[PDB]
Amino acid sequence: RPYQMEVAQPALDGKNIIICLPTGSGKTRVAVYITKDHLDKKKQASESGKVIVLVNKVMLAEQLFRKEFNPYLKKWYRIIGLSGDTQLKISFPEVVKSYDVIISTAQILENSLLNLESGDDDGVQLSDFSLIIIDECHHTNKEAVYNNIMRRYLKQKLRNNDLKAIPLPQILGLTASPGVGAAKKQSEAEKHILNICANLDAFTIKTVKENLGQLKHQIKEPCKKFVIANPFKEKLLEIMASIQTYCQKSPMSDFGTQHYEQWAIQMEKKAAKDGNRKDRVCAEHLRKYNEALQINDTIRMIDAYSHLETFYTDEKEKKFAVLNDETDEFLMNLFFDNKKMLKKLAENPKEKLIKLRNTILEQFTRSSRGIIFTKTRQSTYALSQWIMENAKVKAHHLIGAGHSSEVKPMTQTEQKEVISKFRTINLLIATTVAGLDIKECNIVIRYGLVTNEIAMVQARGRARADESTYVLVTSSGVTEREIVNDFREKMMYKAINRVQNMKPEEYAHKILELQVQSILEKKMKVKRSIAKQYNDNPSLITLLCKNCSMLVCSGENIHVIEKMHHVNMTPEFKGLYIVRENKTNGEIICKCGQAWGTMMVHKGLDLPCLKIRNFVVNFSPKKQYKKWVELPIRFPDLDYSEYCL
RNA sequence: UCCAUGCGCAUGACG
RNA sequence: CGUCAUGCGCAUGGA
Ligand SMILES: [Zn+2]
């Protein structure tokens, strides 16, 4: 392509660069062009032609292995589409020793490199290659993993320069808008761009200026648009005030925010440091009440009632299964005295939801397509069920994959499923997952959201088909945030055009400085990291429960499996804990009712594994970490010769 | 295909 | 530095 021609042109001979273009301009295709010409150059030179294409995500890897690299190189060259989940019969160093072209994923590579410079399995170095290709360069700032790679590259380049010579590979680099970082200033942005380049050790950026018109003919752009707009709550607030007085809790802030939550968690910390009740227990309950609040700010109040209903339901189930004090008695009765009545209040009408329904219905009377963003998963589920109740345009939710923070997440397969159904669902409900292959779209809304400029442009790329209906529902400073996204998009060109028109000498000087700076930063960080974990004590401690400061385990009685998990056999421990299971790894609970861990099935054994998240330490410098890795002191791996017979 | 777990990473808001 | 929310990758064991 013509616009692609010049931007590719320098890379054809040396010229480790960056490229940045907008959505839809087929950057994969030009990348293929550079590949084929490079490999043909190596056939002309009879040199080791190798390309080790990198990404951040598996799905783009599979996508390109289907659609882009094979259909243009299926004949000439060897290709393979790699991942961490796709079980490959062979290790990585062989697909280095074969398969001249590689689609891949990042941390596979770094793992092989570590195995190189740390023993185990046959390693690999960068010197085996002649070229590297990247997508989404903008992640190359804050030691994100595909930046260890270039720090190694920079280390070896400076070894070459102190020599000045073992060779090193050409380095392409692609991206959308390259992102700007922590800026209200042009100088900071410029410095950021230079940090990015020197983390890639590139030469220029080389964007498109000549043929912007033939390209503009392709990209129909969206229209930047804004479309913007008790008593049940107050009863709950009065309950909260009652509880504050009940245990002398000083908020130092208002109800319905994050600050209140933060102070509650700090009370939980202090009271575990004390081992005292009525203090952290209230922190937990008020954390729950504040959840209910700041969903009530945005969600139908029935959903908060259901949230806390299931909560206290589980609480009663815990305590009864335990039995099968005044504090929990007060709290439970305080809830259940108002439970049914608040259920009654929840049905009453009287919002963001109302303007929202209005906009939505008006578009679907205008138009077919539908996209929704927001912050959280529970919001997606709740609004999905709610619109399923409200008289309608079928719908479906979407969320990510992490098994974190409340929910049973979804599946990659099922994500693909729902996306194809949308290629048929009318309106999707998603968290920040949806920069992906969803085009020909109208009404990407932002219901109670914030995003950054790069997320903004990735959302732009998804709304197409000659119809943009950017909508925003948060007012009754968020309009500020689209305005600053525009401002940053202006600033980025303002800085790129300043650095393109820059001397090569001073350019090289600044980039060398930033390279040395980042390398020394990594070195000092590794120093402090090695200094970090040095204790490795067998048994120095006693693990106690956190509601009740009762002894639970000792320092030596613990053992390790899978070099991941911890366990306490020695059924003197078994005199303590209680089991539960409802809906196949059953859960443990306390002699009070605290939840502790899981009965993990391992090699026939029902080992009781516990999570440090729900226990407290006594070396009494009481401490708490939430993660074993925080704790330097080491425990042994298990020897089954104990359990025999 | 599903389950559970550990680890690292970035983003945004907040202090 | 911590908190929250969100998203991503890798490595495990099992069905
Ligand atoms: Zn207890």
Residue numbers in the entry: 310 to 473, 479 to 543, 549 to 643, 670 to 695, 699 to 715, 719 to 743, 749 to 780, 783 to 792, ...
Pull text from the paper.
The cooperative assembly of MDA5 into ATP-sensitive filaments on dsRNA induces oligomerization of its tandem N-terminal caspase recruitment domains (CARDs) (Berke and Modis, 2012, Peisley et al., 2011). The helicase consists of two RecA-like domains, Hel1 and Hel2, and an insert domain, Hel2i, all of which form contacts with phosphate and ribose moieties of both RNA strands. The helicase and CTD, linked by a pair of α helices referred to as the pincer domain, form a closed ring around the RNA.
The maps had distinct helical twists of 74°, 87°, and 91°, respectively, but similar rises (43–45 Å). The intermediate-twist (81°–91°) and high-twist (91°–96°) structures have 15 bp of dsRNA and no interpretable density in the catalytic site. The protein-RNA contact area decreases as twist increases, with 2,315 Å2 for Twist74, 2,102 Å2 for Twist87, and 1,926 Å2 for Twist91. Within Hel2i, Gln581 is positioned in the Twist87 and Twist91 structures to form hydrogen bonds with either or both bases of an RNA base pair. In contrast, in the Twist87 and Twist91 structures the Hel2 loop does not form any base contacts and is less firmly engaged with the RNA major groove. The two residues form interface II contacts only in the Twist87 and Twist91 structures, with the C-terminal tail of the adjacent subunit. Consistent with this, in the mid- and high-twist semi-closed structures (Twist87 and Twist91), the Hel2 loop is less firmly engaged with the RNA major groove, the RNA backbone is in a similar position as in the ground state, and the overall helical rise is reduced by 2 Å relative to the transition state. Hence the RNA is less distorted in the low-nucleotide-occupancy Twist87 structure than in the transition state, which has the same twist. Notably, the Hel2-RNA backbone interactions of the Twist87 and Twist91 structures are in the same register as in the ground state structure (Twist74) despite having the same 15-bp footprint as the transition state structure.
